[PDB]
């Protein structure tokens, strides 16, 4: 039959789509974690700068 052909045609597209769309929902979850990570790394860098500078200022004053 012609109908036994057709059911294999949907079940084929509808797995490719759902693997593509779990390869976007994975990729985003990665890039966002590495984003979140880097936005606290940069937060680390700032704190040092502002404390190293500050201690020198208060020393020179005294």
């Amino acid at each position: 039959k012609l109908e036994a052909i057709l059911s294999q045609e949907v079940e084929a597209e509808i797995q490719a789509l759902l693997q593509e769309a779990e390869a976007k929902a994975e990729a985003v979850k990665r890039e966002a974690e590495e984003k979140a990570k880097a936005l606290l790394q940069a937060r680390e860098r700032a704190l040092e700068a502002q404390y190293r500078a500050a201690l020198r200022r208060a020393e020179s004053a005294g």
């Binding site: 109908e3 057709l6 949907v10 779990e22 929902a25 979850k29 979140a36 936005l39």
Partner: protein, 48 residues
């Protein structure tokens, strides 16, 4: 044959694509929501 077999099957083959587009979008939206809220927490924290 008879065209009523494949006529009323086509309108199920059509549903098999349709439910596919749904669960593609509705999954990638959640991840974007999880990213948005994650990078907001990373501000709330950084500023605190």
């Amino acid at each position: 044959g008879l065209i009523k077999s494949l006529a009323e099957k086509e309108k199920q083959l059509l549903e098999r694509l349709e439910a596919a587009k749904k669960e593609a979008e509705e999954r990638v939206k959640r991840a974007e929501a999880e990213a948005k809220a994650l990078l907001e927490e990373a501000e709330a924290k950084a500023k605190a």
